[PDB]
Design a protein around this nucleic acid. Structure first.
Ligand SMILES: [Mg+2]
Ligand SMILES: [Mg+2]
Ligand SMILES: [Mg+2]
Ligand SMILES: [Mg+2]
Ligand SMILES: [Mg+2]
Ligand SMILES: [Mg+2]
Ligand SMILES: [Mg+2]
Ligand SMILES: [Mg+2]
Ligand SMILES: [Mg+2]
Ligand SMILES: [Mg+2]
Lengths: 205, 293, 159, 170, 48
RNA sequence: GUCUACGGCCAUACCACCCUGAACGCGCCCGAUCUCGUCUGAUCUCGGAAGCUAAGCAGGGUCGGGCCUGGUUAGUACUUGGAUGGGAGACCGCCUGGGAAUACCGGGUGCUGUAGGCUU
RNA sequence: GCUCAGGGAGGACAGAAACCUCCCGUGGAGCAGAAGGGCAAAAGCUCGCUUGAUCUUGAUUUUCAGUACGAAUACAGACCG
RNA sequence: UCAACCUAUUCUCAAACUUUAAAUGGGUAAGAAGCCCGGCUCGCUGGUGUGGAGCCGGGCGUGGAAUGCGAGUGCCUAGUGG
């Protein structure tokens, strides 16, 4: 019953979020965004593969959930059940409209909301899998299988960051040994040389 | 727990008051309605008579507003009344009248209008208003700044007002807030205001305490006793102070001394010193940890 | 079709700046305005009296009339194909002087002083602002070290 | 050797009786705490309207008063004599005040009229220190600083050394 | 049978055929709108 | 060096805690006859000078939060004009000139006008 | 003259929510209504007195044709609060 | 334990959100109607032959950025308003 994505594919409109003015939106069907062993520290998954995009287009929430399931299925088949962590780094906020014809015509044509849609830039990361450093080909194959659930051209890039952090994977170990970083779950905490030094003597206590 | 109210968001969104509004001193609403000259007057000054009653003296100034600040024309305080012979009691209604009189006569002598516009040489207490005479240079017109005093009846702000009015300033005023205007019968008996100007309430309270109990009298009044101020001397002392002020109103400053240049408060620590403080704190913590382990 | 309200479209225009809300500062009141003063307009939301129109927020005119709170100024407004020299009544806190007249005034007074003097002295000193000429010929010294060589960076995708 | 401008004082003793209705009960409760204090109390109205309790907006539902000084100390001593000088550790506010409540005013030392009846009271002692007038004077209003405030233990030690009462826990 | 509603297409060159010409600047412009008490005084100063 | 009275721009001045204030001040403070106002001399008003810098306030401190001003981000994003450039499109590249902002890393932490003191 | 929304800590019945008290509180409240602006010794809330919500000629702005009506802005002449 | 809560973090947004904040753009100024003196007048403003404005009289051309171009003004008027 939903129109094809090639109708609602280009970033044609102003971004039109679910708000006080556009209410009555049917709910986005991707609602789980992070999967796998999402309760695992930064230290035990060092590898991070990003499905980056290569077009300025619109991905549907249907396609985001289809690619989530297509990645998760291959990851729990290949890397074991909890040896990975996928996260979908797009949330569909733009909602799209449907002009229903049943006779009026184009008189007063402004659609009811039909669905939700994520707008993506050239180089904005769609999905990302955090895994161990020997599960490289499995994550490339999982992202390559999930690319067929999207329109357009997506590329696959294995980053030099330490998983889901903004710090580089070569100097992450030196920084965490120098105690400028602190593990606090799936992320890491950055500590400047700017605090009150009771925090300093608490860390080096 | 509670949610922390004064966070980074609170301080980033926080706007400060003006500095005088934070310090508490000024009311910008009344100050804007009081000092702003009309724009068709074109840089004509607008004069104010500022009254501030402190705990121990009374500041009476006359100032007009420029862009950099209120340049004060003339100033007259209450602690300079022992030059004329009011030894102690410098914050009461009578000393408010005396310093208003001194402000008026000193400003008139500063401008050159002490012979003209004599005002009330004898003190009556009733309504007076210095109406200007033709040919001679016109009367000095200024407006009364109370600041933050709740301007109710019998206020030393209006005592200094009546002091300037009897000195010769033409200030707009009503005889509603002088002591004597009773709220019931809605008239104004000027002899009660004269008693308050001459300090007869203080002399009568002095007599009342030395009749009721002399321990409370010596606790309440002591510098009066030290400067041998008696109740019968009070009105004649304030009249001689009025005559002394109206005969010699000019202020002569104290001479400026050669300083010693000694600094009484701690100077601001420098960048090198405070980085060395945090270096020594870290090194001392680490050596205390190795001498604890 | 848009509404034709007096304050339509002036959400961000008559609003105060960030953390500069509150009491209007008093030098704005204490500045005095003659006639013939070149005067900028910038309407302000805290004082609703004497509000200049959104057509004139940002325009500069000339004072022709001063009253006891407000000045009348003569601004050029452009409507469809003409320019009207029209006059408006603006309260005093919607208004600044312009320093664009002031730079001309100081240039005139220093030109007139260096035309008064250095004329019985004999020299002839330049009084017109010629525009910024091309750079004259100049040696550039490479004191010792060689010019550092640049060459483009290889492409690596960092995101 | 301690600075005499940090003497713990009682700044006020405020009393109220929240009767919950207007008219006869409220006027005679006003008369009973006027018999207590010696000054005419005031009538506290209602902010909101809750019909579960039986009150309406702007309806006079309570009587309160404020006592200062020697009268405050003597009324407080009467109330603590009712409360046998035994206060709980939860009867102390974090800002250093304290307060308690009694159930019949006949225990205070006020004789009875069947025209009036019996009522209970909330007593609340707002402790202070010399200098707390900074927080509510007008001309240069400031705050009170950190060293000069009154903490909870610093108040209840004062209570149990000035009244020789006990702080029973719970 | 609809039609076009509003346009400012050809209007700029229609204006700039005879030019956006600035107002007629003239020495001694008039006194209408000047403060009447000020102008009473001005014309008494001219009277005497 | 510094304070009061009135201020100007209104955080480089705010906020939290700690330290130190000599002299003059500014305060806290002591009272309620009178002026005045309250349930209450707490506030306001009124008369004072026994005590105290405890607080306000002032000066200083914090690998402080903030604020101000710099570096980075970055000639990046965006962009005026241009091509019979590319691309199926989306969009991108180039020629011509302009050119941002976070995070991250430094520096600063009120200046000042008029009047009157203190440092005999 | 006072500070508002909210929160914390206390107090006989009293509680999740009646009233009293302290502390924090840049507006998160209120300003009749729609929204946007604006506002903290106020434009809010509470009191006291009130009728400038009055009589009158011109100028101006806004839509604009640079015309009306509407609404509004500075002035001016009294008569007042 | 599991929730709310709270504090430092983290992913993604906004036409009717915003601390910041461009490019293009919109006013004004680039002098003789301008400066600088001397003096009168005023019932307005006025501590103050104060302030402001208006009048007289005199002195000053290096015509006060580049470029380019003779300008200003008044009648009568068609057609047009898909
Ligand atoms: Mg569209
Ligand atoms: Mg006032
Ligand atoms: Mg058509
Ligand atoms: Mg048409
Ligand atoms: Mg007292
Ligand atoms: Mg102190
Ligand atoms: Mg101290
Ligand atoms: Mg800091
Ligand atoms: Mg008011
Ligand atoms: Mg109103």
């Amino acid at each position: 019953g939903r129109r094809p994505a090639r109708c609602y594919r280009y970033c044609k409109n102003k971004p039109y979020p679910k708000s006080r003015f556009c209410r009555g939106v049917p709910d986005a069907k991707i609602r789980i965004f992070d999967l796998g062993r999402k309760k695992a520290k930064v230290d035990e998954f060092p590898l991070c593969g990003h499905m980056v995009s290569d077009e300025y287009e619109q991905l549907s929430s249907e396609a985001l959930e289809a690619a989530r399931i297509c990645a998760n299925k291959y990851m729990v088949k290949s890397c074991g059940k909890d040896g990975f962590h996928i996260r979908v780094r797009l949330h569909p906020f733009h909602v799209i409209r449907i002009n229903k014809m049943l006779q009026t015509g184009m008189r007063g044509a402004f659609g009811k909301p039909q669905g939700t849609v994520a707008r993506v830039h050239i180089g904005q990361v769609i999905m990302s899998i955090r895994t161990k450093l020997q599960n490289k080909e499995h994550v490339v194959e999982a992202l390559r299988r999930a690319k067929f659930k999207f329109p357009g051209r997506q590329k696959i890039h294995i980053s030099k960051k330490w998983g889901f952090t903004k710090f580089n994977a070569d100097e992450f170990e030196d920084m965490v040994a120098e105690k400028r970083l602190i593990p606090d779950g799936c992320g890491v905490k950055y500590i400047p040389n700017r605090g009150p030094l009771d925090k300093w003597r608490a860390l080096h206590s | 727990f509670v949610k922390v109210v004064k966070n980074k968001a609170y301080f980033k969104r926080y706007q400060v008051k003006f500095r005088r509004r934070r310090e508490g001193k000024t009311d910008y609403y009344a100050r804007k309605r009081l000092v702003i000259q009309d724009k068709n007057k074109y840089n004509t000054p607008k004069y104010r008579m500022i009254v501030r009653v402190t705990n121990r003296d009374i500041i009476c100034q006359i100032a007009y507003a420029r862009i950099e600040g209120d340049m004060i024309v003339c100033a007259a305080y209450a602690h300079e009344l022992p030059k004329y012979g009011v030894k102690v009691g410098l914050t009461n209604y009578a000393a408010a009248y005396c310093t208003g009189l001194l402000l008026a006569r000193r400003l008139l002598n500063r401008f050159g209008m002490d012979k003209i516009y004599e005002g009330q040489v004898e003190v009556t207490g009733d309504e007076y208003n210095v109406e200007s005479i033709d040919g001679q240079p016109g009367a000095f017109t200024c407006y009364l700044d109370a600041g933050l005093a709740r301007t109710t009846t019998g206020n030393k702000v209006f005592g200094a007002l009546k002091g300037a009015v009897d000195g010769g300033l033409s200030i707009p005023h009503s005889t509603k807030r002088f002591p004597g205007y009773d709220s019931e019968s809605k008239e104004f008996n000027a002899e009660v205001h004269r008693k308050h100007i001459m300090g007869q309430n203080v002399a009568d309270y002095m007599r009342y305490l030395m009749e009721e109990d002399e321990d409370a009298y010596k606790k309440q009044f002591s510098q009066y006793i030290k400067n041998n101020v008696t109740p019968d001397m009070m009105e004649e002392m304030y009249k001689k102070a009025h005559a002394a002020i109206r005969e010699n109103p000019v202020y002569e400053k104290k001479p400026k001394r050669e300083v010693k240049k000694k600094r009484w408060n701690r100077p601001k620590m420098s960048l090198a010193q405070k980085k060395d403080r945090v270096a020594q704190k870290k090194a001392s913590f680490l050596r205390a940890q190795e001498r604890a382990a | 079709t848009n509404t034709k309200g007096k304050r339509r479209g002036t959400r961000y225009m008559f609003s105060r700046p960030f953390r500069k809300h509150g009491v209007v500062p008093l030098a704005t009141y204490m500045r005095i305005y003659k006639k013939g003063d070149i005067v900028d307009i910038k309407g302000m939301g805290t004082v609703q009296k004497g509000m200049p129109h959104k057509c004139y927020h940002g325009k500069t005119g000339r004072v022709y009339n001063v009253t006891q709170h407000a000045v009348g100024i003569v601004v050029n407004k452009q409507v469809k194909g003409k320019i009207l020299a029209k006059r408006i009544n603006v309260r005093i806190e919607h208004i600044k002087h312009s320093k664009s007249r002031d730079s001309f005034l100081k240039r005139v007074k220093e030109n007139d002083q260096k035309k008064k003097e250095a004329k019985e002295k004999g020299t002839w000193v330049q009084l017109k602002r010629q525009p910024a000429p091309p750079r004259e010929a100049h040696f550039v010294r490479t004191n010792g070290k060689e010019p550092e060589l640049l060459e483009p960076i290889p492409y690596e995708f960092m995101a | 050797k301690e600075n005499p401008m940090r003497e713990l004082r009682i700044r006020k003793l405020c009393l109220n009786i929240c009767v919950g209705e207007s008219g006869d009960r409220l006027t005679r409760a006003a008369k009973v705490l006027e018999q207590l204090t010696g000054q005419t109390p005031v009538f506290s109205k209602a902010r909101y309207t809750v019909r579960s309790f039986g009150i309406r907006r702007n309806e006079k539902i309570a009587v309160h008063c404020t006592v200062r000084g020697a009268k405050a100390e003597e009324i407080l001593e009467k109330g603590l004599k009712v409360r046998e000088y035994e206060l709980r550790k939860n009867n102390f506010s974090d800002t250093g005040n304290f307060g308690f409540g009694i159930q019949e005013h006949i225990d205070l030392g006020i004789k009875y009229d069947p025209s009036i009846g019996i009522y209970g009271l909330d007593f609340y002692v707002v402790l202070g220190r010399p200098g707390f007038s900074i927080a509510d004077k007008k001309r240069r209003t400031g705050c009170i600083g950190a060293k000069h405030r009154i903490s909870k233990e610093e108040a209840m030690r004062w209570f149990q050394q000035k009244y020789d009462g006990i702080i029973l826990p719970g | 049978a609809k039609s076009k509603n509003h346009t400012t297409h050809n209007q700029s060159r229609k204006w700039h055929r005879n030019g956006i010409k600035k107002p007629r600047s003239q020495r001694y412009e008039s006194l209408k709108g000047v403060d009447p008490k000020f102008l009473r005084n001005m014309r008494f100063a001219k009277k005497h």
